[PDB]
Design an enzyme around this catalytic site. Structure first.
Site, PDB file in Angstrom:
ATOM      1  N   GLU A  35       0.874  -1.443   0.018  1.00 25.31           N
ATOM      2  CA  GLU A  35       0.075   0.267  -0.208  1.00 25.31           C
ATOM      3  C   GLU A  35       1.157   1.161  -0.023  1.00 25.31           C
ATOM      4  O   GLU A  35       0.370   2.227  -1.025  1.00 25.31           O
ATOM      5  CB  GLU A  35      -0.798   0.200   1.417  1.00 25.31           C
ATOM      6  CG  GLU A  35      -2.061  -0.586   1.165  1.00 25.31           C
ATOM      7  CD  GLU A  35      -3.305  -0.683   0.051  1.00 25.31           C
ATOM      8  OE1 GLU A  35      -3.049   0.357  -0.872  1.00 25.31           O
ATOM      9  OE2 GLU A  35      -3.930  -1.770   0.512  1.00 25.31           O
ATOM     10  N   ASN A  46      -7.876   8.343  -5.696  1.00 24.26           N
ATOM     11  CA  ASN A  46      -9.125   7.413  -5.919  1.00 24.26           C
ATOM     12  C   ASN A  46      -9.128   8.818  -7.515  1.00 24.26           C
ATOM     13  O   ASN A  46      -9.983   9.261  -7.134  1.00 24.26           O
ATOM     14  CB  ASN A  46     -10.165   6.363  -5.014  1.00 24.26           C
ATOM     15  CG  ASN A  46      -9.333   6.299  -3.959  1.00 24.26           C
ATOM     16  OD1 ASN A  46      -9.306   6.313  -2.837  1.00 24.26           O
ATOM     17  ND2 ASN A  46      -8.493   5.731  -4.264  1.00 24.26           N
ATOM     18  N   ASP A  48     -12.316   8.951  -7.590  1.00 22.35           N
ATOM     19  CA  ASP A  48     -13.781   9.227  -7.374  1.00 22.35           C
ATOM     20  C   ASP A  48     -13.922  10.415  -6.656  1.00 22.35           C
ATOM     21  O   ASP A  48     -14.622  11.067  -6.594  1.00 22.35           O
ATOM     22  CB  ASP A  48     -14.470   8.151  -6.778  1.00 22.35           C
ATOM     23  CG  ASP A  48     -13.921   8.014  -5.244  1.00 22.35           C
ATOM     24  OD1 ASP A  48     -12.836   8.468  -4.600  1.00 22.35           O
ATOM     25  OD2 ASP A  48     -15.169   6.696  -4.234  1.00 22.35           O
ATOM     26  N   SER A  50     -11.728  10.538  -3.630  1.00 19.52           N
ATOM     27  CA  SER A  50     -10.977  10.492  -2.406  1.00 19.52           C
ATOM     28  C   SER A  50      -9.971  10.176  -2.224  1.00 19.52           C
ATOM     29  O   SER A  50      -9.457  10.092  -3.622  1.00 19.52           O
ATOM     30  CB  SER A  50     -12.037   9.313  -1.937  1.00 19.52           C
ATOM     31  OG  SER A  50     -11.498   8.040  -2.805  1.00 19.52           O
ATOM     32  N   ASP A  52      -6.449   8.082  -0.241  1.00 24.55           N
ATOM     33  CA  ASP A  52      -5.982   7.022   0.218  1.00 24.55           C
ATOM     34  C   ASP A  52      -4.318   7.873   1.438  1.00 24.55           C
ATOM     35  O   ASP A  52      -4.079   8.146   0.821  1.00 24.55           O
ATOM     36  CB  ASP A  52      -5.205   5.384   0.237  1.00 24.55           C
ATOM     37  CG  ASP A  52      -6.439   4.979  -0.872  1.00 24.55           C
ATOM     38  OD1 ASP A  52      -7.871   5.160  -0.580  1.00 24.55           O
ATOM     39  OD2 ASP A  52      -6.230   5.350  -2.173  1.00 24.55           O
ATOM     40  N   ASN A  59      -8.926   4.769   3.132  1.00 25.04           N
ATOM     41  CA  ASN A  59      -9.836   5.923   2.706  1.00 25.04           C
ATOM     42  C   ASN A  59     -10.074   7.189   2.633  1.00 25.04           C
ATOM     43  O   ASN A  59     -11.324   6.461   3.148  1.00 25.04           O
ATOM     44  CB  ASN A  59      -9.878   5.070   1.697  1.00 25.04           C
ATOM     45  CG  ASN A  59     -10.848   5.557  -0.262  1.00 25.04           C
ATOM     46  OD1 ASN A  59     -11.320   7.207   0.023  1.00 25.04           O
ATOM     47  ND2 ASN A  59     -11.664   4.287  -0.932  1.00 25.04           N
ATOM     48  N   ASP A 101     -15.255  -4.795   9.237  1.00 23.03           N
ATOM     49  CA  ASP A 101     -16.212  -4.249   8.968  1.00 23.03           C
ATOM     50  C   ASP A 101     -17.530  -5.119   7.878  1.00 23.03           C
ATOM     51  O   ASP A 101     -18.356  -4.929   7.749  1.00 23.03           O
ATOM     52  CB  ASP A 101     -16.228  -2.458   7.668  1.00 23.03           C
ATOM     53  CG  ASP A 101     -17.146  -2.481   6.827  1.00 23.03           C
ATOM     54  OD1 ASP A 101     -18.123  -1.198   7.125  1.00 23.03           O
ATOM     55  OD2 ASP A 101     -17.248  -2.483   5.561  1.00 23.03           O
TER      56      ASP A 101
END
Length: 129
Positions: A35, A46, A48, A50, A52, A59, A101
């Site tokens: 990562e 990202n 969209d 957003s 990270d 995110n 989650d």
């Protein structure tokens, strides 16, 4: 801060990430490697809009507030900049929530594609932990 491999392992273990939700320490170290290359200051945008953040590329769509991800959530209740600190406490605490989650470490696409099903214990071999 750019961690060494065993250095990060030790920090993750002290914060109780080792075996958390059943994911051994090497899983976490391998996730971090792919990562962020162990770099707490890593950031990546990202598609969209957003972003990270940090050693585990958490995110802003869901987990932290960066002020520029309209319509996002802040489920770890932290500014995304907390995730860039040399101290990994916030990243670890937030990662514990994320991995709980429902999809486990599949939340981290780089873990799924580069770590899952591999000899992840290699990432902590040699370390004195």
């Amino acid at each position: 801060k750019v961690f060494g491999r065993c250095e990060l392992a030790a920090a993750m273990k002290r914060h109780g990430l080792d075996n958390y939700r059943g994911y051994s320490l090497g899983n976490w170290v391998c996730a971090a490697k792919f990562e962020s290359n162990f770099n707490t200051q890593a950031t990546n945008r990202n598609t969209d809009g957003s972003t990270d953040y940090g050693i585990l590329q958490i995110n802003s769509r869901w987990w932290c507030n960066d002020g520029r991800t309209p319509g996002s959530r802040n489920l770890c209740n932290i500014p995304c900049s907390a995730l860039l600190s040399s101290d990994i406490t916030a990243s670890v605490n937030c990662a514990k929530k994320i991995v709980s989650d429902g999809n486990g470490m599949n939340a981290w696409v780089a873990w799924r594609n580069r770590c899952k099903g591999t000899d992840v214990q290699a990432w902590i071999r040699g370390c004195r932990l």
